[PDB]
Amino acid sequence: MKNVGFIGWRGMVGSVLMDRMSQENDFENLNPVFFTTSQAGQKAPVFGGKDAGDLKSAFDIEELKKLDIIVTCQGGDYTNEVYPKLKATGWDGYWVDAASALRMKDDAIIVLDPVNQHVISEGLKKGIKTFVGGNCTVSLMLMAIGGLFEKDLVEWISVATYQAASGAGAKNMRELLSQMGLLEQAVSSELKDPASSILDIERKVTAKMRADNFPTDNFGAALGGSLIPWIDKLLPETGQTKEEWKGYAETNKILGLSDNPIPVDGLCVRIGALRCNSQAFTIKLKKDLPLEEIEQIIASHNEWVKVIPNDKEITLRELTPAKVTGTLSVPVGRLRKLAMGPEYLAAFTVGDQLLWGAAEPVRRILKQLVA
Amino acid sequence: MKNVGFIGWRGMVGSVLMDRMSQENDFENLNPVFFTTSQAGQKAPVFGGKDAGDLKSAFDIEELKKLDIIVTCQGGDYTNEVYPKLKATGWDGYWVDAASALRMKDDAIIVLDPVNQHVISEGLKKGIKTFVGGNCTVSLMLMAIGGLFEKDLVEWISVATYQAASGAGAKNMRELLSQMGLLEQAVSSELKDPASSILDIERKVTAKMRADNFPTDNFGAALGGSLIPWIDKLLPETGQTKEEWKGYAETNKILGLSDNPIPVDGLCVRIGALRCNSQAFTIKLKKDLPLEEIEQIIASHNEWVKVIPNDKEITLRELTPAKVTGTLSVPVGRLRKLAMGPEYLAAFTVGDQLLWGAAEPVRRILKQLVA
Numbered sequence: 106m107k108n109v110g111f112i113g114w115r116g117m118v119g120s121v122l123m124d125r126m127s128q129e130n131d132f133e134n135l136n137p138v139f140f141t142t143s144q145a146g147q148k149a150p151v152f153g154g155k156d157a158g159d160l161k162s163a164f165d166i167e168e169l170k171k172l173d174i175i176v177t178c179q180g181g182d183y184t185n186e187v188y189p190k191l192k193a194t195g196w197d198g199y200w201v202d203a204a205s206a207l208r209m210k211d212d213a214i215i216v217l218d219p220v221n222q223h224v225i226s227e228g229l230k231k232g233i234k235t236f237v238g239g240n241c242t243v244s245l246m247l248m249a250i251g252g253l254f255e256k257d258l259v260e261w262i263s264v265a266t267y268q269a270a271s272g273a274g275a276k277n278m279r280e281l282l283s284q285m286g287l288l289e290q291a292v293s294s295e296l297k298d299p300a301s302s303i304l305d306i307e308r309k310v311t312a313k314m315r316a317d318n319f320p321t322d323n324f325g326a327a328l329g330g331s332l333i334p335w336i337d338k339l340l341p342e343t344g345q346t347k348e349e350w351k352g353y354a355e356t357n358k359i360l361g362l363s364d365n366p367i368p369v370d371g372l373c374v375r376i377g378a379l380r381c382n383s384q385a386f387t388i389k390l391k392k393d394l395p396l397e398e399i400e401q402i403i404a405s406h407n408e409w410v411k412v413i414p415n416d417k418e419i420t421l422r423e424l425t426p427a428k429v430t431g432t433l434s435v436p437v438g439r440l441r442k443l444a445m446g447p448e449y450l451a452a453f454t455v456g457d458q459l460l461w462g463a464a465e466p467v468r469r470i471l472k473q474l475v476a
Numbered sequence: 477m478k479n480v481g482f483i484g485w486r487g488m489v490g491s492v493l494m495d496r497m498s499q500e501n502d503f504e505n506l507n508p509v510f511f512t513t514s515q516a517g518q519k520a521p522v523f524g525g526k527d528a529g530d531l532k533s534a535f536d537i538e539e540l541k542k543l544d545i546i547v548t549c550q551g552g553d554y555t556n557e558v559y560p561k562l563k564a565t566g567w568d569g570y571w572v573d574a575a576s577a578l579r580m581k582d583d584a585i586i587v588l589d590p591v592n593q594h595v596i597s598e599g600l601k602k603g604i605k606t607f608v609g610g611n612c613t614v615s616l617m618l619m620a621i622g623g624l625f626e627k628d629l630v631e632w633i634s635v636a637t638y639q640a641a642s643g644a645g646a647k648n649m650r651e652l653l654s655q656m657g658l659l660e661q662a663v664s665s666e667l668k669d670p671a672s673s674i675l676d677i678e679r680k681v682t683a684k685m686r687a688d689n690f691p692t693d694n695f696g697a698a699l700g701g702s703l704i705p706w707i708d709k710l711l712p713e714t715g716q717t718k719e720e721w722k723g724y725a726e727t728n729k730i731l732g733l734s735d736n737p738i739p740v741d742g743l744c745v746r747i748g749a750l751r752c753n754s755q756a757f758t759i760k761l762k763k764d765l766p767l768e769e770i771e772q773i774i775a776s777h778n779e780w781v782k783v784i785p786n787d788k789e790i791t792l793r794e795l796t797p798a799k800v801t802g803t804l805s806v807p808v809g810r811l812r813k814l815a816m817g818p819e820y821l822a823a824f825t826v827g828d829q830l831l832w833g834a835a836e837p838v839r840r841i842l843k844q845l846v847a
């Protein structure tokens with residue numbers, strides 16, 4: 106069986122990949138070899154009921170060179186380090202990555218098979234050996250409205266995101282939780298007392314949120330009870346942040362439309378959600394079609410997207426992070442025409458950023474590479 | 477000196493108004509009369525160092541009929557009951573309302589004087605006697621980009637909101653806070669153990685958020701750690717919620733363009749913030765102007781709007797609910813041209829929903845009416 110190496114299997118994304126792989130018995134048709142950046146020699150974990158020897162150093166090129174496929178969830182720093190060194194040896198195996206590091210490489214293909222399988226297979230024949238997961242937000246967007254691009258109905262998409270703390274890292278999720286606790290703690294008794302003044306409570310919660318002893322070390326500002334309309338670094342040439350820039354760059358590379366690119370732009374905002382990224386869309390369509398047809402085109406693209414009817418009770422129950430968290434479902438709703446015209450479509454979607462937005466496309470390309 | 481009655485002065489919006497009036501000495505040039513729907517006969521609040529006798533009944537038409545101006549923050553059900561009975565007596569004084577009830581009536585003007593003083597002035601001369609504050613998000617939007625409408629540069633605006641808990645009520649803010657506390661408490665110990673599993677932490681928080689005992693009666697769903705992409709009731713004829721519908725309806729009546737409406741549409745989403753409504757805009761301009769000119773036009777409209785440089789550090793410091801809560805500042809940043817073209821402009825704004833979104837416009841028209 107093909108020898109597959111796993112790097113970053115212990116991380117947050119890695120842990121999700123391991124769990125998903127165990128659920129689908131992905132360890133059956135492959136020989137697993139586990140690496141580490143801090144536990145070399147130690148006893149390798151037990152997945153798929155198998156027993157790898159001891160953890161090998163993720164930096165041992167000779168060891169890696171023996172592998173047919175490398176699946177990494179370690180991070181960009183690691184990849185930019187080892188990858189060039191491994192290729193420099195002549196190694197011709199496959200490199201499956203969850204980090205963005207190699208996404209825009211001329212010899213790398215961004216994978217999201219339920220959306221761009223043709224691009225993938227084509228790359229495979231062509232000799233492409235590097236496959237990278239796409240930006241979580243772009244991935245979730247395409248899993249929700251892929252049918253529209255599939256039908257070549259999209260002229261341009263305007264996006265406003267509602268991104269979870271989890272997308273920034275495990276330490277960021279923990280900071281959000283700490284902030285939420287401190288906010289309630291600041292007015293614990295006042296909340297219990299029905300006679301208390303709501304303005305008195307707000308004043309106290311706002312003061313705590315602005316206090317020096319309020320944990321903001323990771324976001325650079327309060328997230329719980331607030332929001333941050335800026336994610337990643339600035340791009341001086343356009344004014345977009347790197348997260349916003351990915352919409353255009355990655356959507357078109359995933360779909361293979363670099364020759365006739367579709368404008369995808371907007372604002373990415375971080376909010377107090379744990380691990381589900383939500384998005385509001387203003388989709389300018391190339392033609393005016395019945396809303397019911399639009400819905401079917403969307404719902405039939407893949408089996409994970411789930412159209413949520415534009416009803417209050419149903420929306421509150423199905424189109425929220427609280428509902429989607431930990432599932433492979435990609436609900437999209439609030440679908441209707443906008444006032445600008447019949448070609449303007451409104452849509453809101455929610456999706457788990459660690460599954461389709463991270464571990465799932467990786468787990469899937471791997472399965473396709475092996476048995 | 478004019479006789480002015482105050483209704484709903486005890487609630488959340490009413491309290492902020494009383495606060496602002498006390499700070500601005502708005503009671504000096506008027507004779508205050510306080511009413512109540514539940515505490516008639518009890519001592520009135522002594523704002524402005526002035527002392528009214530006892531609370532009068534807000535349902536006493538004979539007492540109301542004696543006033544020159546009635547200022548109410550009581551609510552739509554109150555107004556819909558009393559306004560008709562009072563006007564039926566032939567009463568011809570001024571009615572200033574914070575509730576949406578009379579907003580779309582032809583004998584009423586939606587007031588936001590920094591934006592439509594001309595409408596207010598024309599209406600007064602025409603005989604209009606009813607002034608109503610506009611929807612909070614619409615008001616906050618115009619305070620931010622009124623300069624573009626002032627120059628007739630706006631073709632249409634696509635909106636995505638991030639609305640706070642207080643926008644729905646004092647009960648809802650309290651529920652949000654209680655929810656936040658419960659979420660952290662579910663993993664209090666794990667959070668202080670730096671070696672604990674993040675996925676274990678998230679599964680526990682999510683489980684709590686999904687527990688029947690999780691307090692969700694006010695929102696009908698979890699808000700803390702999540703979001704609710706639905707505000708108000710559904711309008712079957714367009715697919716919009718009443719909240720979303722107001723963008724087109726109120727923006728245009730405020731601007732006096734109900735005859736030739738500028739399309740303003742989008743999605744209104746509730747998030748876990750206490751009292752600031754934020755909005756992401758995609759503005760289709762009529763002309764292709766340099767970014768710097770657009771900024772000058774936006775900044776020059778009024779003294780409260782504040783253009784925030786498209787810089788990360790400044791944005792995290794100035795463009796957030798944490799910074800603007802309790803202030804009259806209306807920051808607008810992330811200004812840049814979008815990928816769709818040089819006529820497409822992006823912008824993100826944040827504003828306190830209880831000030832410019834509620835009490836401030838009311839407070840201002842009252843001052844105009846009393847002198």
Ligand SMILES: NC(=O)c1ccc[n+]([C@@H]2O[C@H](COP(=O)([O-])OP(=O)(O)OC[C@H]3O[C@@H](n4cnc5c(N)ncnc54)[C@H](OP(=O)(O)O)[C@@H]3O)[C@@H](O)[C@H]2O)c1
Binds near residue numbers: 112115142273275670
């Ligand atoms: N966060 C998201 O929502 C998201 C979404 C899509 C893609 N990604 C990307 O996926 C890659 C990995 O992200 P991540 O958030 O999974 O990184 P992470 O949680 O920090 O894990 C990465 C590595 O940190 C090391 N580590 C040190 N202490 C650890 C501990 N106590 N528990 C677990 N691991 C520990 C592990 O390496 P050793 O075992 O060798 O020590 C682990 O492989 C990044 O490139 C990221 O950008 C993230």
Ligand SMILES: NC(=O)c1ccc[n+]([C@@H]2O[C@H](COP(=O)([O-])OP(=O)(O)OC[C@H]3O[C@@H](n4cnc5c(N)ncnc54)[C@H](OP(=O)(O)O)[C@@H]3O)[C@@H](O)[C@H]2O)c1
Binds near residue numbers: 487
């Ligand atoms: N919340 C916002 O951010 C916002 C923004 C824009 C517009 N508005 C609108 O402004 C109007 C009032 O909203 P609101 O949020 O201020 O309503 P509220 O807080 O419920 O106050 C309304 C009334 O409820 C009664 N009440 C019962 N128990 C009370 C208590 N424990 N404390 C204070 N009052 C109590 C009071 O009437 P009595 O004293 O007669 O008993 C009070 O005047 C509504 O039409 C609302 O839609 C609200």
Ligand SMILES: C[As](C)(=O)[O-]
Binds near residue numbers: 203
């Ligand atoms: C969240 As990314 C750095 O994998 O585009």
Ligand SMILES: C[As](C)(=O)[O-]
Binds near residue numbers: 612722
């Ligand atoms: C903020 As309203 C409910 O008076 O449109």
